[PDB]
Coordinates of C-alpha atoms and ligand atoms in Angstrom, one line a residue:
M1 CA -58.0 -116.3 35.6
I2 CA -56.6 -114.2 32.7
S3 CA -53.8 -111.7 33.5
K4 CA -55.0 -108.0 34.0
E5 CA -52.4 -106.9 31.3
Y6 CA -54.7 -108.4 28.6
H7 CA -57.7 -106.1 29.3
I8 CA -60.2 -108.9 29.2
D9 CA -63.2 -108.6 31.4
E10 CA -64.9 -111.6 33.1
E11 CA -68.3 -110.3 32.2
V12 CA -67.9 -108.5 28.8
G13 CA -64.7 -110.1 27.5
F14 CA -62.9 -107.8 25.0
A15 CA -65.5 -105.1 25.3
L16 CA -64.5 -102.1 27.4
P17 CA -66.4 -102.4 30.7
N18 CA -68.7 -99.5 31.5
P19 CA -67.5 -97.1 28.7
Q20 CA -67.2 -93.4 29.5
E21 CA -70.0 -91.3 27.9
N22 CA -68.7 -87.8 28.6
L23 CA -65.2 -86.2 28.2
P24 CA -63.7 -83.4 30.2
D25 CA -65.4 -79.9 29.5
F26 CA -62.1 -79.0 27.7
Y27 CA -63.3 -81.3 24.8
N28 CA -66.9 -79.9 24.6
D29 CA -66.3 -78.8 21.0
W30 CA -65.4 -82.3 20.0
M31 CA -68.4 -83.8 21.9
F32 CA -71.1 -81.5 20.4
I33 CA -70.1 -82.5 16.8
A34 CA -70.0 -86.2 17.6
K35 CA -73.4 -86.2 19.4
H36 CA -75.0 -84.3 16.5
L37 CA -73.7 -86.2 13.4
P38 CA -77.1 -87.1 12.1
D39 CA -78.2 -83.4 12.0
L40 CA -74.8 -81.9 11.1
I41 CA -74.2 -84.3 8.2
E42 CA -77.8 -84.0 6.7
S43 CA -77.6 -80.2 6.9
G44 CA -74.2 -80.0 5.2
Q45 CA -72.8 -78.3 8.4
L46 CA -70.5 -81.1 9.6
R47 CA -67.4 -80.3 7.6
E48 CA -67.5 -76.5 8.3
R49 CA -67.9 -77.2 12.1
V50 CA -64.8 -79.5 12.0
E51 CA -62.9 -76.9 10.0
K52 CA -63.8 -74.2 12.7
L53 CA -62.3 -76.3 15.5
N54 CA -59.1 -75.1 17.3
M55 CA -56.4 -77.7 17.7
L56 CA -56.9 -79.2 21.2
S57 CA -54.2 -80.9 23.2
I58 CA -54.7 -84.6 24.1
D59 CA -52.9 -84.0 27.4
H60 CA -56.2 -83.6 29.3
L61 CA -57.3 -87.2 28.4
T62 CA -55.7 -88.7 31.5
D63 CA -57.1 -92.3 31.7
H64 CA -57.7 -95.2 29.3
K65 CA -61.5 -94.8 29.3
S66 CA -61.3 -91.1 28.4
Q67 CA -58.7 -91.8 25.7
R68 CA -60.9 -94.6 24.2
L69 CA -64.0 -92.3 24.3
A70 CA -62.0 -89.5 22.5
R71 CA -60.9 -92.1 19.9
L72 CA -64.5 -93.0 19.3
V73 CA -65.5 -89.3 19.2
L74 CA -62.7 -88.4 16.8
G75 CA -63.1 -91.6 14.7
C76 CA -66.8 -91.0 14.1
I77 CA -66.1 -87.3 13.3
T78 CA -63.3 -88.4 10.9
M79 CA -65.6 -90.8 9.0
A80 CA -68.4 -88.2 8.8
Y81 CA -65.8 -85.7 7.5
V82 CA -64.3 -88.0 4.9
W83 CA -67.5 -89.5 3.6
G84 CA -69.8 -86.5 4.1
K85 CA -73.5 -87.3 3.3
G86 CA -72.3 -90.8 2.1
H87 CA -73.0 -90.0 -1.6
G88 CA -69.4 -90.3 -3.0
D89 CA -68.4 -86.6 -2.5
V90 CA -65.2 -87.2 -0.5
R91 CA -62.7 -85.2 1.5
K92 CA -59.1 -86.4 0.8
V93 CA -57.5 -84.2 3.5
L94 CA -58.4 -84.3 7.2
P95 CA -57.7 -80.8 8.7
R96 CA -54.8 -80.4 11.1
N97 CA -57.0 -79.2 14.1
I98 CA -58.5 -82.7 14.3
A99 CA -55.9 -84.8 12.4
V100 CA -52.9 -83.9 14.8
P101 CA -54.7 -84.8 18.1
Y102 CA -56.4 -87.9 16.6
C103 CA -53.0 -89.2 15.3
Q104 CA -51.3 -88.3 18.6
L105 CA -54.0 -90.1 20.6
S106 CA -53.9 -93.1 18.1
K107 CA -50.1 -93.3 18.5
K108 CA -50.5 -93.3 22.4
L109 CA -53.1 -96.1 22.3
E110 CA -51.1 -98.0 19.6
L111 CA -54.1 -98.0 17.2
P112 CA -54.3 -96.6 13.6
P113 CA -55.9 -93.2 13.1
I114 CA -59.2 -94.6 11.7
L115 CA -62.4 -95.8 13.4
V116 CA -62.0 -99.5 14.3
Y117 CA -64.2 -102.2 15.7
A118 CA -62.8 -101.6 19.2
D119 CA -64.0 -98.0 18.9
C120 CA -67.5 -98.4 17.4
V121 CA -68.5 -101.7 19.1
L122 CA -66.3 -102.3 22.1
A123 CA -66.3 -98.7 23.6
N124 CA -69.6 -97.4 21.9
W125 CA -72.2 -98.6 24.4
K126 CA -74.0 -98.0 27.7
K127 CA -76.7 -99.6 29.9
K128 CA -79.9 -97.7 30.0
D129 CA -80.5 -99.0 33.6
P130 CA -77.2 -100.0 35.3
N131 CA -79.1 -102.3 37.7
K132 CA -80.6 -104.3 34.8
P133 CA -78.9 -107.0 32.6
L134 CA -76.7 -106.7 29.5
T135 CA -79.6 -107.2 27.0
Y136 CA -80.4 -105.3 23.8
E137 CA -83.6 -103.7 25.4
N138 CA -81.5 -102.3 28.3
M139 CA -78.7 -101.0 26.0
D140 CA -77.9 -98.1 23.6
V141 CA -74.9 -96.9 21.6
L142 CA -73.0 -93.7 22.3
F143 CA -72.7 -92.5 18.7
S144 CA -74.5 -93.0 15.4
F145 CA -73.9 -91.4 11.9
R146 CA -77.3 -90.9 10.3
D147 CA -80.9 -91.3 11.3
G148 CA -82.1 -94.8 10.2
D149 CA -78.5 -96.1 9.7
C150 CA -79.1 -99.1 12.0
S151 CA -75.9 -98.3 13.9
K152 CA -77.6 -99.3 17.2
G153 CA -78.6 -102.7 15.9
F154 CA -75.4 -103.5 14.1
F155 CA -73.0 -102.3 16.9
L156 CA -75.1 -103.6 19.8
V157 CA -75.7 -107.1 18.3
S158 CA -71.9 -107.3 17.5
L159 CA -71.3 -106.3 21.2
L160 CA -73.8 -108.9 22.5
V161 CA -71.9 -111.6 20.5
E162 CA -68.7 -110.4 22.1
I163 CA -70.3 -110.6 25.6
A164 CA -71.7 -114.1 24.9
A165 CA -68.2 -115.1 23.9
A166 CA -66.7 -113.8 27.2
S167 CA -68.1 -117.0 28.9
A168 CA -65.8 -119.1 26.6
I169 CA -62.7 -116.7 26.9
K170 CA -62.6 -117.2 30.7
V171 CA -62.3 -121.0 30.2
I172 CA -59.0 -120.6 28.1
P173 CA -56.7 -120.7 31.2
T174 CA -58.5 -123.9 32.3
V175 CA -57.7 -125.4 28.9
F176 CA -53.9 -124.6 29.1
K177 CA -53.7 -125.5 32.8
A178 CA -55.5 -128.9 32.1
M179 CA -52.9 -129.7 29.3
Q180 CA -49.9 -128.8 31.4
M181 CA -51.2 -130.7 34.4
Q182 CA -52.3 -133.7 32.2
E183 CA -55.9 -133.4 33.4
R184 CA -57.9 -135.1 30.6
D185 CA -61.3 -134.9 32.3
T186 CA -60.8 -131.2 33.1
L187 CA -59.7 -130.5 29.5
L188 CA -62.7 -132.4 28.1
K189 CA -65.1 -130.4 30.3
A190 CA -63.4 -127.1 29.4
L191 CA -63.7 -127.8 25.6
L192 CA -67.4 -128.8 26.0
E193 CA -68.0 -125.5 27.9
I194 CA -66.3 -123.5 25.2
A195 CA -68.5 -125.2 22.5
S196 CA -71.6 -124.4 24.6
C197 CA -70.7 -120.7 24.8
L198 CA -70.0 -120.5 21.1
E199 CA -73.4 -122.1 20.4
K200 CA -74.9 -119.5 22.7
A201 CA -73.0 -116.7 20.8
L202 CA -74.5 -118.0 17.6
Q203 CA -78.1 -117.7 19.0
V204 CA -77.2 -114.1 20.1
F205 CA -76.0 -113.4 16.5
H206 CA -79.6 -114.3 15.3
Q207 CA -80.9 -111.0 16.8
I208 CA -79.2 -109.0 14.0
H209 CA -82.3 -109.5 11.8
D210 CA -84.6 -107.8 14.4
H211 CA -82.6 -104.6 14.5
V212 CA -80.9 -104.1 11.1
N213 CA -82.5 -103.7 7.6
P214 CA -80.5 -104.6 4.4
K215 CA -81.0 -101.3 2.5
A216 CA -80.0 -99.0 5.4
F217 CA -77.0 -101.2 6.3
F218 CA -75.7 -101.4 2.7
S219 CA -76.5 -97.9 1.5
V220 CA -75.6 -96.0 4.7
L221 CA -73.8 -97.7 7.6
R222 CA -71.4 -99.7 5.3
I223 CA -70.4 -96.4 3.7
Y224 CA -69.5 -94.7 7.1
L225 CA -67.5 -97.8 8.2
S226 CA -65.5 -97.9 5.0
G227 CA -61.8 -97.0 5.0
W228 CA -59.1 -95.9 2.6
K229 CA -56.9 -98.9 1.8
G230 CA -57.4 -100.1 -1.8
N231 CA -60.4 -97.7 -2.1
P232 CA -60.7 -96.1 -5.5
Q233 CA -62.4 -93.1 -3.9
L234 CA -59.2 -92.3 -2.0
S235 CA -56.6 -94.3 -4.0
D236 CA -53.6 -92.8 -2.3
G237 CA -55.2 -92.9 1.2
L238 CA -56.0 -89.9 3.4
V239 CA -53.9 -86.9 4.2
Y240 CA -53.6 -86.4 7.9
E241 CA -52.8 -82.7 7.8
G242 CA -49.9 -81.6 10.1
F243 CA -48.9 -85.2 11.1
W244 CA -47.7 -86.8 7.9
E245 CA -47.2 -84.8 4.7
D246 CA -48.1 -87.7 2.5
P247 CA -51.4 -89.7 2.4
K248 CA -51.7 -92.9 4.4
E249 CA -53.9 -95.9 3.7
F250 CA -55.8 -97.6 6.5
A251 CA -58.5 -100.3 6.4
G252 CA -62.1 -99.6 7.5
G253 CA -64.1 -101.4 10.2
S254 CA -64.2 -105.2 9.9
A255 CA -65.3 -108.3 11.8
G256 CA -61.7 -109.3 11.3
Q257 CA -60.7 -106.7 13.9
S258 CA -62.8 -108.6 16.6
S259 CA -60.5 -110.5 18.9
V260 CA -63.2 -113.3 19.3
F261 CA -63.3 -113.5 15.5
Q262 CA -59.7 -114.7 15.8
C263 CA -58.9 -116.1 19.3
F264 CA -60.8 -119.4 19.2
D265 CA -59.2 -120.3 15.9
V266 CA -55.8 -119.6 17.6
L267 CA -56.9 -121.5 20.7
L268 CA -57.9 -124.6 18.7
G269 CA -54.9 -124.5 16.3
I270 CA -57.0 -123.7 13.3
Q271 CA -54.1 -122.0 11.5
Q272 CA -56.1 -119.2 9.9
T273 CA -53.0 -117.0 9.5
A274 CA -51.0 -119.9 7.8
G275 CA -50.7 -120.9 4.1
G276 CA -49.9 -117.5 2.5
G277 CA -53.4 -116.6 1.1
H278 CA -55.3 -113.4 1.2
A279 CA -57.4 -114.5 4.2
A280 CA -54.4 -115.3 6.3
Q281 CA -52.8 -112.0 5.4
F282 CA -55.9 -110.0 6.4
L283 CA -56.3 -111.6 9.8
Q284 CA -52.7 -110.9 10.7
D285 CA -52.9 -107.3 9.4
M286 CA -56.1 -106.7 11.5
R287 CA -54.3 -107.6 14.7
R288 CA -52.7 -104.2 14.4
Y289 CA -56.2 -102.6 14.4
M290 CA -57.0 -104.3 17.8
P291 CA -56.0 -102.7 21.1
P292 CA -52.4 -103.7 21.9
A293 CA -53.5 -105.7 25.0
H294 CA -55.7 -107.8 22.8
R295 CA -53.0 -108.2 20.1
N296 CA -50.8 -109.3 23.0
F297 CA -53.4 -111.8 24.2
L298 CA -53.5 -113.4 20.7
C299 CA -49.7 -113.5 20.8
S300 CA -49.7 -115.3 24.2
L301 CA -52.3 -117.9 22.9
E302 CA -50.1 -118.5 19.8
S303 CA -47.1 -119.0 22.1
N304 CA -48.7 -121.6 24.4
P305 CA -48.6 -125.3 23.4
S306 CA -51.1 -126.6 20.8
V307 CA -54.5 -127.8 22.0
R308 CA -55.1 -129.5 18.7
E309 CA -51.8 -131.4 18.8
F310 CA -52.5 -132.4 22.5
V311 CA -55.9 -133.8 21.6
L312 CA -54.6 -135.5 18.4
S313 CA -51.7 -137.2 20.4
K314 CA -53.9 -138.8 23.1
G315 CA -55.9 -141.5 21.1
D316 CA -59.0 -140.4 23.0
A317 CA -62.4 -140.3 21.2
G318 CA -64.1 -138.3 24.0
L319 CA -61.4 -135.6 23.8
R320 CA -61.6 -135.5 20.0
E321 CA -65.4 -135.2 20.2
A322 CA -65.2 -132.2 22.6
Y323 CA -62.6 -130.5 20.4
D324 CA -64.8 -131.1 17.3
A325 CA -67.8 -129.6 19.2
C326 CA -65.7 -126.4 19.3
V327 CA -64.7 -126.6 15.7
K328 CA -68.4 -127.3 14.6
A329 CA -69.6 -124.2 16.6
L330 CA -67.0 -122.1 14.8
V331 CA -68.2 -123.5 11.4
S332 CA -71.8 -122.6 12.3
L333 CA -70.7 -119.0 13.2
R334 CA -68.9 -118.6 9.9
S335 CA -71.9 -120.1 8.0
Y336 CA -74.2 -117.7 9.8
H337 CA -72.0 -114.7 9.0
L338 CA -72.0 -115.7 5.4
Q339 CA -75.9 -115.7 5.4
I340 CA -75.8 -112.2 6.9
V341 CA -73.4 -110.9 4.3
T342 CA -75.8 -112.4 1.6
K343 CA -78.9 -110.7 3.0
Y344 CA -77.2 -107.4 4.0
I345 CA -74.6 -106.8 1.3
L346 CA -74.9 -109.1 -1.8
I347 CA -78.6 -108.7 -2.4
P348 CA -78.8 -105.0 -1.7
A349 CA -75.8 -104.5 -4.0
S350 CA -77.6 -106.4 -6.8
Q351 CA -80.7 -104.2 -6.4
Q352 CA -78.5 -101.0 -6.6
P353 CA -79.1 -99.4 -10.0
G354 CA -70.2 -105.3 -3.3
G355 CA -69.7 -108.1 -0.7
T356 CA -67.9 -110.7 -2.9
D357 CA -64.5 -110.0 -1.4
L358 CA -65.9 -110.4 2.2
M359 CA -67.9 -113.5 1.1
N360 CA -64.7 -115.1 -0.3
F361 CA -62.8 -114.2 2.9
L362 CA -65.4 -115.8 5.1
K363 CA -65.6 -118.9 2.8
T364 CA -61.9 -119.4 3.2
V365 CA -62.1 -119.0 6.9
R366 CA -65.0 -121.5 7.1
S367 CA -63.2 -124.0 4.8
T368 CA -60.1 -123.9 6.9
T369 CA -62.3 -124.4 10.0
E370 CA -64.1 -127.4 8.5
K371 CA -60.8 -129.0 7.5
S372 CA -59.7 -128.9 11.2
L373 CA -62.4 -131.4 12.2
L374 CA -60.6 -134.5 13.7
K375 CA -63.4 -137.1 13.4
Ligands
LIG1 C1 -71.8 -109.2 11.9 C2 -70.9 -108.6 13.0 C3 -70.0 -107.6 12.4 O1 -69.4 -107.8 11.3 N1 -69.7 -106.5 13.1 C4 -68.9 -105.4 12.8 C5 -68.1 -105.3 11.7 C6 -67.4 -104.1 11.4 C7 -67.5 -103.0 12.3 F1 -66.9 -101.9 12.0 C8 -68.4 -103.1 13.3 C9 -69.1 -104.2 13.6 C10 -70.1 -109.7 13.7 C11 -69.4 -110.9 13.0 C12 -69.1 -111.1 14.5 N2 -68.4 -112.2 15.2 C13 -68.3 -113.4 14.7 O2 -68.7 -113.7 13.6 C14 -67.6 -114.5 15.5 C15 -66.6 -115.3 14.9 C16 -66.0 -116.3 15.7 C17 -66.3 -116.4 17.0 C18 -67.3 -115.6 17.6 CL1 -67.7 -115.7 19.3 C19 -67.9 -114.6 16.8 C20 -70.6 -110.7 14.7 C21 -68.9 -109.6 14.6

């Protein structure tokens, strides 16, 4: 059993269980804009409506679920405001009425003032029927950007992979208990169970093709998820009016912000953050874009003794095989993600009258994973 301080759910893992859909009535002016982004963006009315907002206090967001919903609401509004219709006409200043409360709320939750994975995947969902299972057909997102953006497909399939991975996350304490207690058979079983759940998560990943089309993803959704760190469109970053006087750079939404994208590498001692390269740098930097509880969880996993070293030390083929089953499953996940980036970013980019940096990142992550096979 994982400690409650890490905000990991037995059923949905790093996802926020049963996210709030509605804020207090005090925040109706925020909520109307967020719920009407498709129409407000298209009609050129989004920015004016944000500019007409009064500065609202974050004091009436009293609980974590309300604070996370507000982050999702404000984050989606902020991306809509910065990127506009998604045609390259950009806003370089976020007005104070929205920028102040967003930054204040962000500071409170220990997250940067930009839409992150934890917002648009982990807290951006509901069950259609709460008495039916966590499946795509019984689920919907809370917020989208544009009609036809495939935000439902992209966010929900991401979430469903997170949920599939929850089954592996709950075995992590069994792994560390087994090592401490010197329980070889228990450890072997635990590793095999993790490998099984990672294999299951890969099959869930396959659903992306059914709900996302390349053109819409590349030309629309990818634009709204983009940030302002090393972005030539906002080379100095974004001005958060009334919070900082000088523009600040923050990275956009990335798979690297998923805690399951990192935690099994950490568990298995695949030192993805070692060696000094770009990939290692990015993975560490993205921990600050995760909720602090999840950042803290990764820290705790790092601080425990090494599973890899344990298995390596024992002279035990069965244990090595079970460890390698986990490593193999991670390789297959990276390989699949590469195939998706090819179909959804590289090819559309080629047909545009992008993706290589993400491809190179994922190749490095995969290569490092492959090299951890014990054999
Ligand atoms: C494609 C999708 C994605 O990028 N979503 C995304 C990005 C940016 C956003 F702003 C919002 C959503 C994925 C990659 C994925 N998870 C793993 O690849 C993985 C890696 C190791 C272990 C496990 Cl269990 C899973 C599915 C998240």
